[PDB]
Amino acid sequence: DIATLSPNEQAAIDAWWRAANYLSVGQIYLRDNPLLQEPLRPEHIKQRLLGHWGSDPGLSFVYVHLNRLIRRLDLNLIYVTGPGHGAPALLANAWLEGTYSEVYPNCQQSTAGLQQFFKQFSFPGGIGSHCTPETPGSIHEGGELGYSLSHAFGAALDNPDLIVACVIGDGEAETGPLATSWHSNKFLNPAQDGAVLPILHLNGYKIANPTLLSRISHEELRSLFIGYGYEPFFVEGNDPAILHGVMASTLATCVQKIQAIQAAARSGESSDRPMWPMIVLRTPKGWTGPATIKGHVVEGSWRSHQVPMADVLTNPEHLQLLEDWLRSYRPEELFDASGAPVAELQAIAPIGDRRMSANPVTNGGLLRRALTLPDFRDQAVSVPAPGKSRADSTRPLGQFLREVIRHNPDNFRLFGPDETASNRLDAVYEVTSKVWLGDRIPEDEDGGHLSDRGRVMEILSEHTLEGWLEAYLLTGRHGFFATYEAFAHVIDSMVNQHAKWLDVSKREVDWRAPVSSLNILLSSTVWRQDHNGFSHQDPGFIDLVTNKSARVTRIYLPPDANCLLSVADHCLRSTDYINVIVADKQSHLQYLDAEAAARHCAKGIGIWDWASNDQGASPDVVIASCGDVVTLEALAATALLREHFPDLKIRFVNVVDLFRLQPDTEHPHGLSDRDFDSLFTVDKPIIFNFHGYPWLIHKLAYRRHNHNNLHVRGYKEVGNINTPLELAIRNQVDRFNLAIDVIDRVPHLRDRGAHVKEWLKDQIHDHIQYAYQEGIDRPEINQWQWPF
Amino acid sequence: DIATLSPNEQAAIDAWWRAANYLSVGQIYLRDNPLLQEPLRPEHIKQRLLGHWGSDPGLSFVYVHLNRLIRRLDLNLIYVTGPGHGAPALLANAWLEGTYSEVYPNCQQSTAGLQQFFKQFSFPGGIGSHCTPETPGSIHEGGELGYSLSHAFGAALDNPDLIVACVIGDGEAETGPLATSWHSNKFLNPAQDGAVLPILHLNGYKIANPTLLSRISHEELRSLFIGYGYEPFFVEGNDPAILHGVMASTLATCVQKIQAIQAAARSGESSDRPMWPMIVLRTPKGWTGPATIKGHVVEGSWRSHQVPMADVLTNPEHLQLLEDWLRSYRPEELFDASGAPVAELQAIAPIGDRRMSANPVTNGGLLRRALTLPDFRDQAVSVPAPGKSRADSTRPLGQFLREVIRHNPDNFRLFGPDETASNRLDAVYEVTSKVWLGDRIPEDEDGGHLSDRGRVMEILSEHTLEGWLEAYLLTGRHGFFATYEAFAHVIDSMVNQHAKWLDVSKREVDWRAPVSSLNILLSSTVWRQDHNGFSHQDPGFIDLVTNKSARVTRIYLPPDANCLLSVADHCLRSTDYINVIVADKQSHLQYLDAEAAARHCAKGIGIWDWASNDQGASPDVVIASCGDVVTLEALAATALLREHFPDLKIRFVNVVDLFRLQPDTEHPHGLSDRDFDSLFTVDKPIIFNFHGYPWLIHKLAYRRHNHNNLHVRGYKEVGNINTPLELAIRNQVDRFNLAIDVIDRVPHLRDRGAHVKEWLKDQIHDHIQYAYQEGIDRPEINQWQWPF
Amino acid sequence: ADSTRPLGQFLREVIRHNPDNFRLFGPDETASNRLDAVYEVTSKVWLGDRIPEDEDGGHLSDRGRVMEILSEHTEGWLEAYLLTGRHGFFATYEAFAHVIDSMVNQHAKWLDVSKREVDWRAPVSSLNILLSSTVWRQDHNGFSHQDPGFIDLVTNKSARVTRIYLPPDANCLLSVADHCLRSTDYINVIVADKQSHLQYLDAEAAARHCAKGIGIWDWASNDQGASPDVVIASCGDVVTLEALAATALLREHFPDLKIRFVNVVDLFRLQPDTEHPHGLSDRDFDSLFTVDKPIIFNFHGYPWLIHKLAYRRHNHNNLHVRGYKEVGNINTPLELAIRNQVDRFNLAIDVIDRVPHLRDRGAHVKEWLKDQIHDHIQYAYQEGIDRPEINQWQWPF
């Protein structure tokens, strides 16, 4: 009798639904007089109205039904919200359940607390309009549309009993990231993971236009959602008496199929991809609000979004209509004299931790356990001489990630956009394979590592791929993202959304526990110009990350494999940061030992003693490199200068943590003025060789005393197709161009080095001519190694 | 049958008691191999041993009995710990109950978590030996001995159903603050407050000496506890079979009397001070540990404190004795294969929020509600002309505190050590009176304001009085402390103890929610030399507070009544600070309006425009004052200089928030370099007139550019008896001495002002001679007022 | 060698030679501070019931010259004992010195008025307080967040009534204790550490050192007959070891560097001669600390106290103080020094920054020192104890 609904409890469900809408309108409009004991006056209304009403009836409608299903089947829900502006619906339900009062004791369940609850919403020094980290039981910010469904799947990536209900707006479904994210059901594993229940809020209208998915035929819509792999269920109408029975029946129909699918998967009798249930709602937008106000339809139209009435203080007629709107819910029966909800509402509320707004999954920091990290020195390469031994840097990282997977089989996953095999990270394929959950052929068995059980997800769309990881970290688990640098502009919008969540959660919100860090690995840098990716790769993703504060993002550019392992090991321990690691796929030199890499990453910036020419004397020039390809050119430039100028004294500095360049005033993590002056001399010129746009170094090191003597060579532009050496020549980061620049800046080499500067220009022209004749660099360029 | 014990449950209680002691020794000694699956080896033992063992058996003994009693009577307990070094006992019980695993997911209830649990204790990057804020269910740090009983009463000051069980060591009872704190039962109100059950751990030995209270006769000890007003109960012996029955019976005897007392008080039939229950334990120190190790008695002696055996790694014989010590608890039956406690231990543990280590009272920030306070502008005095109207500054504050009491009748109390009437704070006596709960005479009714119900605590022992407030804030309530400045050295030790609690809770601990701030009001400054207090008052309390970091303490020196109200209003909103407010009882001038005071306290330090001589031109000298008495002298010096030097341009600056002087690098609260240079110009001399030791200003403003031009006048020494004017002359903070100082620093007044400097010295000599003949200052000195 | 044992033997000899007008006071820390040498001839006084277990373990008898009680307030015994005309000695932890904060100000008030204002008051014996188990060692007893702030509040009182002594080793401790038992109208605060340490001064050399109060250590000083490049000064005893260890590192890595080592025992000698006749003159101060070379002061306690005393000096702007700032929850003795930057490596880093001709030459060494800081912290986290060569360090020259 779960599908059927009793009439007596339907009134209580409707009573909860009315109370949620009453509190929703109250915080949008009312500033004082919460229970309308006295007649409404303009001083009780907020001066500026930034709330959104169009999505509020739908979210409150679904939420009360879900509480009914939790009471019977003892489920656990999260309710990630799609539209994101339906926060008044969420906060009203959280207040009714008592969760909001427990989290915020000021907003007590009383008349005075109700006045404070309405006052704080959409107000300075108060909670925001969208669902922010201050909102209890929320993981998705929802301000940017299209990433809600991916966050639903990410939260259930390794929780078997968890159920998540994501409400999808029809306008939101027009976005590109949401269109692809439907296919994520295939990657989800029914045996060991939870179930996601997507709900489509097809109200029919956007802010100003009819939605695309509402103006397609019912047959076309059913065809479209069958192709995504979901079982479509349709709930239509605008009569609450009809809608309560139908929507309760459909929810009970879907959850039993969800339990049937999960039980069949765990039993192993049905090892195939099932059609997941899904619910479609055709309820009009704002169907519980005013119908017509100014001669136009304000219910079930685009006018219902965020503005029922434009002016209330100016026009007393609208205020009277507003007062009649609040009276339509009959608030007198819903609340007692004290202002608390009546005993009818208290009984039907979930009890204890089962409340969706109080679920520990949403505050994933409490659920988070520290990762078990094997020592990376086992997988580190051995270097007898720094700069003379050549080995690929991807293989040590792949072995290290494999060991973490075995030691952390549940709370760790790896993400790649069909580049894990390309990135030479096949070491993790030894113990675990990619998860596909589709039809397979024996040709696939020999070719690709595909299985139903796996810890590596591979989908081309980085929008849904990165969305999975963000929810995975906010749930309390740990993850790692590896991709090319050329396609990092795709996740540019999503990174700012996640960095916004961490920034507010760290400072403003006090009950939010810290979650795991966001680790993104960028490979196949712009300098190598691999076969994949467009010809004009852009390292501009590093710049937009630096626009965000240094207290939420960290950028690491390790030169070799050992320094890459130390960065990867250290970043897997951090909590409230976004870690961007820029390594290169191609085989390179190795400069640091396993022990020396740990000391290097501890400081972030360090002098390389073997590369440095003279110690115990003031250097004539400081040569600095940041990336790994540009580090080789910086080292090669040092070899040329030491060969031609034996008396020249060169200090070589390699930087891994970019934000160490920022002064100590900007952030405590940055180097102090005395520390910076020790590394980079106060007066001698600095020849910085930076991977990426050369101006980024000037932004960080602007406040430094020696900023005027800082010279940066970096990425400027790229030709259609170039050799690795020729590309460095055009950007003037080549070994010869750096050696030319050192001659210019050093005061006593501008006259002595004229002959050498002429010789270097001959070498630039000679290598370019050989590149045009043969198409490949000279063998001594490719096989170069440190001569000292 | 609550007093009696079943034999079967006694074994489970003993099983819990053994497991707590086993975990206690494990974290003191073991670093690896928690369950002793393999034979013990020296690499499993911690190299440096800092944990304390002497108090551990006693604390674990009481804790398990309390969990027995909390299961049957469904009570709520806090268990404030006296010795403070019994943290291994508390952490073991918290781990057994599952609270520690929930708070710290790394220390999971498993074999791996047990290894981590033992490893972290007394280790770098781990929990400390004493009861730190990291310890769940702890409000008292316990490192300083003697303040535990006051914290027991403070936590129950307004929680009626709460029960607090504070364990008192016999060596701790020799301390002065603990001896007085016994009388706090009289001030506790049984009708509206909880009951505190003190327990004496009379183990007989200190770290090196027999305790005083164990070496007195049983008759005299019983006489002493009767004099304190407690009903003494004695539990003795060293046999666990006997001790389990007797101690459980005594606990059941005491709690029913506690419930009888509370029920009788709330019924109103017994309105008299009752004899509260008291428990004495004669159990030997470390009576569950080794007896003899090196030919000396290590059980029940002073050797049992913190060192069972001195060396374990060096001597394998002690390691064998250590291994036999762990085997004596029979750990195999207590834990399963996974390492979790067996089902016998799980059943007897408290369930949910009823756990003593998981009570929300201990983490009072969750329980804290924001204080509802009226607008202070209602009680602010009216000033038509600044500096010309004379009114006492204490009366507006007393009225403001009275209004807060009415609006917050439950979560607010006021504390004053026999000086609330002296400080002219009788405005709060209008609505509420001080609580005494003793015999009363009609002479007391007319003279004093005493009643059973009250919100003002009055006891001149500043030790026990300040201890009540600290627990009251950590419980989540709000309070206010008002006392003389002369006796502020008494609570000097307690402030440092509370400051280190807030410092750790803010930064290191993440689950600690912010508590209310500590507001201390200092009256009767050293300059007025009131009748009370010693002749040589010391303002040195301000200096020791500044030794603590600026991010945990704030010091405010409001000049007048309106600025006092703004400071008091602002500090009642703050959360994680110690607020020290220094004002003077004596009637003074008024300089700021109600609106202007709010702007002044917003900036903290600002230019007084009316006192400033010339605007739109560079001032010749900056005259700054910090206190209130010295502000009058600074203003009077300005009047003299403007009278004798019409062309002189003087900028007057008043400083209220002391820590604003610190540079922005030291703390974000401090003024920036540009802001400081605007207030005090970069080149002109600054004549600072500071209440207190003059060097404190140089400590704060040391890093400033214009520090070398800063001249501070302040308290140096005080004669035996002096007039208020003559005392300023001795310390050279008088109006004439300040005017003399300005003449010296200003370059163009050193020659022109020679005649005026001679005249000022005549005025100094003239007033001193009049003071010797008459004993009082001249009438125009006392009735001075701003002439412009 | 441990520095507590020579003081205990000396206190025992005073007790026998002065059986009536001398007593010792300790708040259950005389045995803790390894002062059991006085237990040989005299025992603690209890006057209560006794058991044979107490007889074997504790030294208790009806007749005794050592007072033991937990409450430091009932220091009140000693103050009246001195005003009676007799002599005493107080030994306690530094962590609980804030307890007697109010009482000390009362006694110093009495002495200052009696010395100057009152003429018929005859001088009485001095108040000698010994503070043991300093904040740097972090012993098992006491709260983890020990505060050396008691030294600061004593300095707030006039230099004519309070004297603060920080002897580095056992011999310098005896000379301070011997000298302070002769003084009359002063409050003597002696800060020594319980734990076993190095020894730097001979019996004769300690007497000369305490006579001057502050003096150059010739063996620790690098070059004589030439102007030193930097002056390394230490005041306490734990920080003296770090100051010496920093000197060893700099002399090893910079053979040409000239370092003058100065040790300060009497704190108030830093005050100028104008403030008090006891303080050093301007010429004497300029001889010890050069007028232009940087001074790397390593002070036990709050680092600002040195700036208060030496504010009026000509070379105050070149004075750099490293001292106690904050303490972690639990740390190794070396790790605690790293947090407050008084470690041997942090001092060596500060010398490199301050010396003008080492800011460029010492960049490699400064990088090496930062590696040593990180390496020792990592070893501390893995093992919980410092490396064996750190604990067993000794002067290599």
Ligand SMILES: Cc1ncc(C[n+]2csc(CCOP(=O)(O)OP(=O)(O)O)c2C)c(N)n1
């Ligand atoms: C990519 C993108 N395009 C446009 C917007 C602006 N926007 C915010 S809410 C909204 C309304 C669309 O919401 P819909 O999915 O129709 O939700 P419903 O009203 O049915 O809840 C729009 C256009 C946005 N945030 N992101």
Ligand SMILES: Cc1ncc(C[n+]2csc(CCOP(=O)(O)OP(=O)(O)O)c2C)c(N)n1
């Ligand atoms: C005022 C003060 N003096 C000395 C100490 C040093 N101390 C720390 S713990 C301790 C032992 C306290 O003895 P007791 O109260 O008998 O405790 P238990 O026997 O239960 O360990 C002492 C003396 C202190 N903390 N405070």
Ligand SMILES: [Mg+2]
């Ligand atoms: Mg819509």
Ligand SMILES: [Mg+2]
């Ligand atoms: Mg004891």
